[PDB]
Structures are given as C-alpha cells and as structure tokens.
Inverse folding.
C-alpha cells in the first residue's frame, strides 16, 4: 500500500512484539533449550564417539579449565562404546538393555568445552548422512512410485517396516501384482542401493529407524532453535534502528546498515552465552557496532579502503576536529602527525585518499545542461603524433628496409617485432638462420652503420621528434 | 595462551616469533581451530630460552641448534658445547679483526679540522 | 673503460659495485653508449677507497660517508676522526657485550663431559 521498503520493514517490525527483561531471559532460555536439544540428541549418535576421539587426539598435543580434565573427560565415552558395541550390533539389535546402555552413553556427555568450529563438524557429518539416506529414499521413490504403476500410498506401509534386508523388495511383488512383475528390470538399481544402505547401517552400527528418529529430533531441535533465533532477532530490531542514528552519514543508505546490524545481531545470538547474567542489548551493541563499522569500511566508498585504514582515518578525522575546536584554524598535517604518533608522509598518504570520487552527474556548470563527463581527458590518447607517426614510421621502415636486399632485414624485422607477433632475441632468430648470436649482432651493427649515416635515412632521422 | 600476550609478558614482539615460525626455529604449535594459535608452557619456555639466547649475542643458527635439543629427555650437552665453543671462537676472531682495524686506523687523523684546502694525507696513503 | 680489469684491480665483482651504484653513496658513472659502466682515474680512486675500507678497514655505513666526503673534494681529516671515534665507541660497546656473553657462557654452560649421563639441565638453567 506504499512505495518505501523501509516503511513496510517498520510495519513488519511492528507486527511482532518486543520483550521485557523476563521475556529476554525467557527467549534466552528458549535458545538454551534449542541448543541443548541438539546437544543431548547428538549424544545418541555413534559418530560422536569418533568425533570425541579425534578431539582427544587433537588436544593430546596441547576463563579456562585445566587440560587434565580434557584428557580424562574425553575417554569414558570410548569405554561406553566398547561395552555397548557387543549389544547394539551383536546378539540382535532389538534389545531393551542395549537401549539402556545407549541412554547410559548419552547421559555422560555433558563435558562439552564448547568450540564453534567443533560444533559445525558433527552437524555437517549428520547432515550429509541424512542427505545420503534422503536421496536413497528419493531414488527408491523414483523407482517405485513413478515406475511399476503403484502410487505413493503403496510404498510407506512396506517402507516403515524394516528397510534392512531383501524382504521389502519382494514385499512389493505382493500376492498378484501384475503391473509390478518386472523384477529384473527394476532390481539393478534397487539391490545396489540396498547394499549401500546395508553398508551405511553397518557403518553406524544401528537400524535405520533409530537413526531416522534421531535425525527427526535433529530437525525438530534445529527448527525450534531457528524459531527462537527468529523471535530473538525480531524482538531486537528496535536495537539496530536505534543504534543506526549515530552513523547516518551520506556514504550508505539506512537499510544496508540495518541489515548489516541484523547479521551482527545474528552472530551475537550464538555469541551471547547468557549464563554470565548480562542483557542482550549491552553485548549485542558491540557486535552491531562492529558490523556497522565493517559496512562503512568495505562499502560507502568507491575505492575500497580496508577497515584498519578506515579506523586510522576516522581517528585522524576526530583528532582534526579536536584540533579545530582547540585552535580555530585549519588543521595542519604536522600537529595531526605528532598527535597520531605516526610519520607525516603516512598522514598525507591517508589524507590523499579522502573521499568518494565526484560522480558523473554533478552540476559543475551554471545550469542542468552540461554535467560531468564532458571534461575528462582521454587516458588512451590518440594524438596527431600517435595516430600519424605510428603508421608512417611503419611505412618508412617498410620502404627503407626493403632496400636491404639480404637477410639483415629479415633478421631485423623480428629483432624488434616489425610485421611479426612475438618479439625475439638473438637466440630465437639464431635458431631459424644463424644460431651463433654474435653473427646476428654483427649484421645488426652493420645495418646500424648503414642506417646511422645522414645520407639516405634522413627521412628516418626526421622521425626523432 | 595466545602468542602476542605471551610475547608481551616475556618482553618479545610477535614479528620475531612469527619469523621463527616461518623458518625451522620454533616447533609448530597446534591450530586452535580459529584465527589464533595456542601455546604450551613448554613452548613458552623454549620461546624465552631462544629470547635469552638471541639477546646475549648468539647467532640464530646455533640458538636453533640449542632449541632443537630442548624439550626432549635426551639433552646431550657435549657436542653442542663444542659447537658453542666454535661459535665463540668465531666471535673472538671477529673481535680480533675489528680490533686489528681499530689499532690499524687510529694514528693518522690528527690535523685538518675542516678547512677548505684540498690537501689530506690520509686518502692518498690509504689509496 | 669497462669494469672488468678495474674489478680485478679493486678486488670485487660486478654485483657488489652494481649494488653500490644502486645505493645513494656512489656518484653516477659514464655509460659508453652501450649501458656499460665507465670509471675514470678519480672513479678508480673512489673505488679503491671504498674497497680499502669495506673489505679492509670499515663497514658500509662509514665507507659510504668517506666516499661521500671524498667527492667534495675538500677532504677533512678531523670529521673522519670524530666519525671513527664514534665508530670505536660503538665497537667497544659491541665487544663489551660479547665479552659479557662469553663470561655468561663460561659461567652457565659448564657441564659433564661425554659419558653415559645424559639429560643435563644446563639448557634449562640458561632458559630461566
Ligand atoms: Ag684536509
């Protein structure tokens, strides 16, 4: 109903409701619940044991805790794995005490020492395992729902049963099935995929239904964490629109700084760690100001000056404003250089790269008839010299060197590149004619002694200007 | 446990230990899965030992040969003692040649306190 | 006069004198229409003066000042005297640093000789 994107952005902000202090700690506790759901669901995964084993191998060569607790508290899950592996895989998979040992392995996981690089690896490995089993189910659906004339409802009732051995394949060749009698015409992909599913199951050491509900718990916890992150970032858009007042200069628009503070607040969500007892606005202020300075350093300038030189030139502008207020006169580079504790040539160098280049549509004249661009000199200049002599000297060499009735002109035209593509040295022109370099040098000196005399090369002499 | 705060505690700079990390001088620490590097207290002991070796006037090759036999239970202190003896013998040879230059030169430059006359007997005798 | 026999006279090679030419302490010589450096008798005197110090009597930071004051040509025999007094002050600070280093090495480097008793803590005592 409007035309400004920032006003309907404010409308979408006003659609959601803000937070009080108790609402802030409630959304922080919802973030904690969304994190800890994945933290306890990953304890039931068999690859977490190998992940903690490679973590113990990484910290073997190593406020903070002592490393002895990292050496001791990263090896009991290996013992639980080697006392569970004789029950979860051997002597049948469907067992109650095997699931009790699985829960015992899961309840000893709280020795986290959380690192954001460590958290990505288990999520990535479980996501590509979920992607592998999902494209396995997708290719099975492509070979069974689309082919052999049976709908999607005749697949899930046999898919949810075992999905381990060959019983589900000839379960789809049921009591009559005249449309699905093509056995060997469809077997060639499905048993090759079932062997891949079986080797995946023997890699994880568990049936496909348990890892299916484990990945469903992963998706549920990730969706709940995403909704908690969404309400956290939506309740704090007043923070970015209230912090974006102090950086409202004419280098960028408002919306780019707002959406950079949005990703700064999104980083501050996972960098919050609310158990210290602080508010989200106070710690998020630093991250959003960092994102705002990063956007005003990378963007808001045609010539992209980096963030450290942006910081030094902002300090130089503040020192120049302070010396303007303390003196009244224009700030010389000497006082700014001695107050910056930097040499003066670096001060003038960062002063040279002062601001965005004058755009092409500024009215430098008296009216709006002639803008900029009608005053720029050509860098690729084509002078009367550069247009006339660059061909007339070529014609003069083609006229004079044609009088050279031997191979000296043929070895001199490739000595510099006249009527040739690649410029050659004496060695490359030697291998064609005269492999000893000094023969070509002596014939070049003879051609020089023939051409340097002001008798017939005076037209070549007049081209020195 | 990072490298520049430990350099500020030990009195060093980060450029020196980064140049030691560039060559084969300091043992490479494990990456802390970020844009930083952690230090073992044994690595800090090797760092301050190499700083004490460089501050007194040892060349960095012989101090590297000292820190290669550091933080290990072998620690042979006879061949490296002979190597440091050859190092200070080369240092004393440098001292001997510089003092040879010192008592070779210093008896010829008494007069001519900066006049505009183009006559000096030092350069025509040396060359 | 291409500098090859001149290089055998002065006792150097083309690379060191080329590096001297690229620095701001040697006067620009003559190029005899081929890019080759030409050195006259005064240039030969400057070359033998800078090689009679850098390889014999001085380092680059003092021989450069000597060859800079030599092409004045009004030479001074007391500016070089206070220059070499500052130079011998610098090298006497240098040799007192090296003799303190030698005394510290002889104080905290004595250990057992070559035998079956390894793991000497003398390197740990030098660590501090
Ligand atoms: Ag004189």
């Amino acid at each position: 109903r409007t035309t400004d994107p920032v006003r309907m952005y404010m409308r979408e902000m006003g659609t959601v409701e803000l937070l009080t202090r108790e609402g802030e700690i409630d959304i922080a506790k919802r973030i904690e619940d969304g994190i800890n759901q994945v933290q306890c669901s990953v304890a039931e995964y068999p690859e977490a044991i190998t992940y903690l084993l490679e973590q113990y191998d990484r910290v073997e060569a190593e406020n903070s805790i002592d490393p002895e607790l990292a050496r001791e508290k990263f090896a009991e899950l290996r013992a639980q794995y080697v006392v569970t592996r004789d029950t979860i895989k051997a002597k049948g998979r469907s067992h109650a005490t095997a699931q009790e040992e699985i829960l015992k392995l899961s309840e000893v996981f709280k020795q986290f020492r959380l690192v954001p690089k460590q958290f990505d690896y288990l999520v990535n490995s479980m996501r590509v395992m979920m992607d592998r089993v999902r494209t396995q189910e997708r290719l099975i659906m492509k070979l069974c729902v689309e082919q052999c004339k049976m709908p999607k409802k005749n697949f899930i009732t046999l898919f949810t049963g075992n999905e381990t051995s060959d019983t589900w394949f000839n379960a789809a060749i049921a009591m009559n099935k005249p449309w699905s009698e093509k056995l060997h015409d469809v077997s060639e992909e499905v048993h090759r995929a079932l062997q891949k599913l079986q080797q995946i199951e023997e890699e994880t050491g568990l049936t496909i239904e348990q890892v299916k509900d484990i990945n469903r718990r992963m998706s549920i916890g990730e969706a709940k964490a995403r909704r908690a992150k969404k309400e956290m970032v939506e309740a704090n858009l007043r923070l970015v629109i209230s912090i974006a007042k102090k950086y409202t200069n004419r280098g960028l628009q408002f919306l780019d700084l707002i959406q950079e503070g949005n990703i700064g607040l999104m980083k501050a969500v996972d960098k919050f760690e609310y158990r210290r007892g602080y508010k989200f606005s106070t710690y998020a202020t630093w991250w959003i100001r960092q994102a705002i300075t990063r956007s005003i350093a990378d963007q808001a300038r045609t010539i992209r000056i980096p963030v450290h030189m942006i910081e030094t030139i902002n300090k130089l502008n503040r020192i120049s404003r302070q010396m303007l207020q303390e003196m009244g006169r224009e700030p010389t580079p000497e006082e700014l250089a001695e107050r910056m504790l930097m040499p003066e040539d670096k001060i003038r160098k960062v002063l040279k790269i002062a601001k965005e280049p004058i755009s092409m549509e500024t009215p430098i004249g008296d009216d709006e008839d002639s803008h900029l661009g009608d005053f720029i000199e050509d860098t690729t200049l084509e002078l009367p010299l550069d247009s006339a002599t660059t061909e007339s000297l070529r014609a003069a060499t083609h006229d004079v060197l044609a009088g050279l009735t031997a191979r000296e002109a043929k070895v001199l035209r490739m000595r510099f590149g006249i009527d040739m593509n690649t410029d050659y040295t004496l060695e490359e022109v030697g291998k064609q004619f005269d492999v000893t370099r000094e023969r070509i040098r002596q014939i070049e000196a003879k051609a020089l002694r023939k051409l340097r005399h002001p008798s017939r090369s005076e037209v070549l002499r007049s081209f020195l200007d | 446990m990072n490298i520049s705060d430990v350099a500020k505690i030990t009195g060093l700079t980060s450029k020196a230990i980064r140049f030691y990390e560039e060559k084969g001088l300091v043992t490479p620490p494990m990456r802390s899965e970020n844009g930083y590097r952690t230090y073992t207290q044994q690595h800090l002991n090797e760092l301050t030992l190499l700083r004490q070796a460089r501050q007194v006037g040892f060349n960095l090759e012989e101090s590297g040969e000292l820190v290669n036999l550091f933080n290990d239970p072998q620690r042979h202190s006879a061949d490296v003692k002979r190597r440091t003896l050859e190092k200070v013998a080369e240092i004393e040879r440098h001292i001997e040649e510089l003092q040879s230059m010192r008592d070779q030169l210093l008896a010829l430059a008494n007069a001519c306190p900066g006049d505009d006359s183009a006559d000096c007997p030092i350069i025509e005798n040396l060359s």
Q: What stands out?
A: Chains C and A do not touch (no CB pair under 8 Å).
